Amino acid sequence: PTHLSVDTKFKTEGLCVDIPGIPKDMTYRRLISMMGFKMNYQVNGYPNMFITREEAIRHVRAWIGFDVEGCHGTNLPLQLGFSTGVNLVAVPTPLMYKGLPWNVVRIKIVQMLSDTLKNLSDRVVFVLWAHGFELTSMKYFVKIGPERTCCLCDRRATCFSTASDTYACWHHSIGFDYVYNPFMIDVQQWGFTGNLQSNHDLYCQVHGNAHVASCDAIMTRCLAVHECFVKRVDWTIEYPIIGDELKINAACRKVQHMVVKAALLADKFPVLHDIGNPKAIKCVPQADVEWKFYDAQPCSDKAYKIEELFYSYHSDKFTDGVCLFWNCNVDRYPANSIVCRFDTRVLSNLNLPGCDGGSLYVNKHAFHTPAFDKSAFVNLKQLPFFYYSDSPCESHGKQVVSDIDYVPLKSATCITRCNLGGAVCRHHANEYRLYLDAYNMMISAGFSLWVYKQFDTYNLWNTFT
């Protein structure tokens, strides 16, 4: 049980308005044949065009919502809509394109998918709310066959060119005209009552129905993300490394230790309330403080209400000491907090569009995160950049930068004994620059840092006496 059997039943009720008379009894094997595709009894890595919900969740980075609306069907123009916001009009002869024949429409489809997916996935998963026209339009831009590799690299082939008779991945498909061996899933097969808009609108108010195919494509992908990542969560599923995952995660650990150690040194809190990951470890193990942990899994639907996390009778006095919320999304942070909150609006290859303003952050695991809301931080301020270190001023080993290329560091934010004494040493200059790179990496990945209003790095200078 790995792939979806072609002999699995496909429910056809959603298809009968576009395809009247369609048999109630239908398999994927018969549906694919009706779509104009021939599988030829082939055991070459592509057993079915359709995939299971479990296979779709493993390939969420490949998801592209797709919808087709009749403009007027061999005689009528079709409006092809994608969750990228693109609408194309194919004549049989929010970006809205005018009617053009299939031979040019298919070139645009290949360019659009390749640019969207080349840094995300090795494939495309068309996410549908199948009513008929989208399935019967596939033969005009899709070719299938055995699994193949790119003509310029080792990656699996996703495109085909009729001009050259060659195959390419998303990175090398310029000038290609056919989508090759795409995958697809029909959300209607999951058991829903009522139409797409009524189901989507139960969980999301950010995607309206501007009555175009791309709006339906967007809503379909949104509903699928809600079902697979919001109401249902699976953190066991691992996702491949596609970018700066490791550097970002290492930076996150460095920044957390730096900020918490400095808050404890500057304000000397007798107790720290660490709220979040039930598997968390003390980020500052040498700190004198009474460290208390509170279990809260990452919220994927709405941000936690602070009244439910803190109230209903723990140290009980969360007002004593400091509260640490490291990626623990709450509606309104208490004034005595240290906070790391992912900004869902960030544009990156790790952050995928999500449900109801939320985003799907995929870094080793998939985490649907509720919409970023500035009002959650009303009791705090933005945490400014600083580097603090009490370690001895001593270089050690071969230096990365040569003596002639090295410039001594000058910075008001290098909080060290050497900078207090008027001249930053080589070791602290190296560590400052490495820390600044890690910090910038974390910020640019979408993380935002917030702190209690009394936080002042001026209080760190007296820890050198």
* Interaction site with ligand UWY (CB under 6 A): 400-401, 406-407, 430, 433-434
Q: What is the C-alpha to C-alpha distance for residues 28 and 258, in angstroms, rounded to an integer?
A: 55
Do the annotations mark residue 69 as ligand-binding?
A: yes
Among 425, 441, 449, 451, binds Zn ion (CB under 5 A): 425
Q: What is the C-alpha to C-alpha distance for residues 46 and 39, in angstroms, rounded to an integer?
A: 9
Among 32, 110, 144, 150, binds Zn ion (CB under 5 A): 150
Catalytic residue set: 67, 69, 134, 211, 216
Q: What is the C-alpha to C-alpha distance for residues 175 and 164, in angstroms, rounded to an integer?
A: 10
User: Do 216 and 69 form a contact (C-beta atoms < 8 A)?
Assistant: yes
Do the annotations mark residue 169 as ligand-binding?
A: yes
Q: Which 399-418 positions form the footprint of Zn ion (CB under 5 A)?
A: 416, 418
Q: Does 62 bind Zn ion (CB under 5 A)?
A: no
Do the annotations mark residue 277 as ligand-binding?
A: yes
Nearer to ligand UWY, 200 or 428 (CB): 428
Q: Which does 174 bind (CB under 5 to 8 A by kind): ligand UWY, Zn ion, none?
A: none
HEC profile for 366-423? EEEECCCCHHHHCCEEECCCCEECCCCCCCCCCCCCCCCCCCCCCCCCEECHHHHCCC
Q: List all residues 6 or more positions away from 173 whose beta carbon is below 8 Å from its beta carbon.
A: 110, 111, 114, 158, 159, 161
Q: Does 159 bind Zn ion (CB under 5 A)?
A: no
Q: Which does 407 bind (CB under 5 to 8 A by kind): Zn ion, ligand UWY, none?
A: ligand UWY
Q: Which does 425 bind (CB under 5 to 8 A by kind): Zn ion, ligand UWY, none?
A: Zn ion
Nearer to ligand UWY, 154 or 403 (CB): 403
> Tokens 């249902």 appear where?
232
Residue 348 CB, nearest approach to ligand UWY (Å): 25
Nearer to ligand UWY, 43 or 407 (CB): 407
The rounded Cα 202 to chain-centroid distance in angstroms is 22
Q: Does 169 bind Zn ion (CB under 5 A)?
A: yes
Q: Does 172 bind Zn ion (CB under 5 A)?
A: yes
Residue 389 CB, nearest approach to ligand UWY (Å): 14
Stretch that binds Zn ion, among 59-67, 201-209, 394-402, 430-438 (CB under 5 A): 201-209
Residue type, 294: Y
Tell me phi and psi for residue 463, to 5 degrees: -80, 0
Terminal CA-CA length for the chain: 67
User: Do 86 and 112 form a contact (C-beta atoms < 8 A)?
Assistant: yes
The rounded Cα 26 to chain-centroid distance in angstroms is 35
Q: Which does 401 bind (CB under 5 to 8 A by kind): Zn ion, ligand UWY, none?
A: ligand UWY
Alpha helices in 21-89 (DSSP H): 28-34, 53-58
Nearer to ligand UWY, 246 or 400 (CB): 400
Tell me phi and psi for residue 78, to 5 degrees: -115, 145
Residue 307 CB, nearest approach to Zn ion (Å): 27
What tokens does 295 get? Answer: 């279990």
- Provide the β-strand partners of residue 185: 127
Annotated binding site for S-adenosyl-L-methionine: 274-280
Annotated binding site: 67, 69, 134, 150, 153, 169, 172, 200, 204, 207, 211, 216, 222, 274-280, 393, 418, 425, 428
Residues that bind Zn ion (CB under 5 A): 150, 152-153, 155, 169, 171-172, 204, 207, 222, 393, 416, 418, 425, 428
